[PDB]
Amino acid sequence: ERGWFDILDDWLKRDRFVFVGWSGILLFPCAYLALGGWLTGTTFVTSWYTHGLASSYLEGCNFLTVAVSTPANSMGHSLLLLWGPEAQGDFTRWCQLGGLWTFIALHGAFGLIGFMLRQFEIARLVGVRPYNAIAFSAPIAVFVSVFLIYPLGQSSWFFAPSFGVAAIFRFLLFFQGFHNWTLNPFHMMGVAGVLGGALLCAIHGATVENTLFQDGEGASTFRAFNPTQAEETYSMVTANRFWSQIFGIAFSNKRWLHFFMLFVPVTGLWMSAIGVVGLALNLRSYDFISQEIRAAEDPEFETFYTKNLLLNEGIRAWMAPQDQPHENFVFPEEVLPRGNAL
Amino acid sequence: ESANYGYKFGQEEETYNIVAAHGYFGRLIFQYASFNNSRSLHFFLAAWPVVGVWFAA
Amino acid sequence: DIDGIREPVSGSLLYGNNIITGAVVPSSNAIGLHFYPIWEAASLDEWLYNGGPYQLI
Amino acid sequence: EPNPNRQPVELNRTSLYLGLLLILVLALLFSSYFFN
Amino acid sequence: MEVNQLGLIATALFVLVPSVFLIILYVQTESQQ
């Protein structure tokens, strides 16, 4: 049977400069639209009616302060389809209501699905094991938990991260002040995975480059390697002795070593994702009850834990009126928490 | 059995096929975004986090 | 007394800390950048109050 | 009537050390939150 | 300090049950030929 399906399959899987595949039907429009929405919004679109903020190059923002901001809190979790009941097909209103944010987030989610299908598709055609796709589950867990589950647990899309540099920084600080997110053991595991992964990246790369075999005569050692050679280009035996004597332990199995490099950052990102699912519900690691009972009763008891909560209380009181304009917070000067003099 | 027993400490021959990896990863992006020289690939792995952390410091 | 204002901060396990809240606490702001080895203190009790251990570590 | 699907199980010494380290470190991390 | 007192047995079983699992698997691997 060589019908139209098989002929289409032939054309999608041609060896061209940019491979396409069946997955490309999903991947390329969604990725291109998510990127184009972000460039269109950060260049031309305001956040005046949703946030009270300028947020485009047109308005005078720079690369650090442009964003595609989230919709107004009054939109709830509306899909904000262009043809939906809020914008009613009006492209200009849709931009002013925050429709580009759901546009980017949803096309981005489906584009990420498409990229992982592409990793599966190409791996099956070339005949490799699909571990690259498996590792990519970690960026997807992060994107889905932070950009979709988290606002879905909260009151509206407004509290999702906005798509911009400084807007993401605001997201970090909001998470410290309101959620005490540095205290969360699921974030801690995420930190260990990301920093541990950076560590492994550097130490593996440096170790290889400094246990090279002399396989050529030039002082530039890059030329002395051939992709089809059968021999290892560096000495695992010398690498093993160096690290055993420097650090006490060393890798001896090169397959274990490279599985471990996959395992560590991937597991870290997955752990951070679980913690953010908790924060969707305000299920925080905010306090240690034993510390609060002692400190309530003993005004001489002070730890770095109690010092940081005072900082969180400052963040909340000082940023909430501007950061949550729909709430209409009016905090007179006299109620604002402040230390001496400052 | 664990695939890790398929590598033996000190063996002379490489334990994976870099040409297959490059053929997969070159098609994922495009051919010239992929390394086929293990030495320059590993130099890149060393350099990127080290330079970034120098800037952080 | 990290900030030199006679307001001591508890850092150790036996004084009410767990693994997450505990610390060795930086030396006092009254010392600034002055060198504070054990032998510059009138006693160990003084050295501990003023955050001597931080400098030594 | 011996079942043909049985297979021996292994845990090597390095895996024991790695496993014990993971469990001890996880305990050291989570214990503070258990005591709260 | 008024800590949760179940924290002690919770930490102790958290260490002991998976650690014991690993020790059983390891020792019976050594005892094989």
Binding site: - | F9 | - | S31 | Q5
Partner: peptide
């Protein structure tokens, strides 16, 4: 109670370091 727990766990880790370094499976070339 809780202080004893924290220090006990810590002490086990330092013991584990000792055996992992000095009583490791020796790497053997082939």
């Amino acid at each position: 109670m809780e202080t004893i727990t924290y220090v006990f766990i810590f002490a086990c880790i330092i013991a584990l370091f000792f055996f992992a370094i000095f009583f490791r499976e020796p790497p053997r070339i082939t």
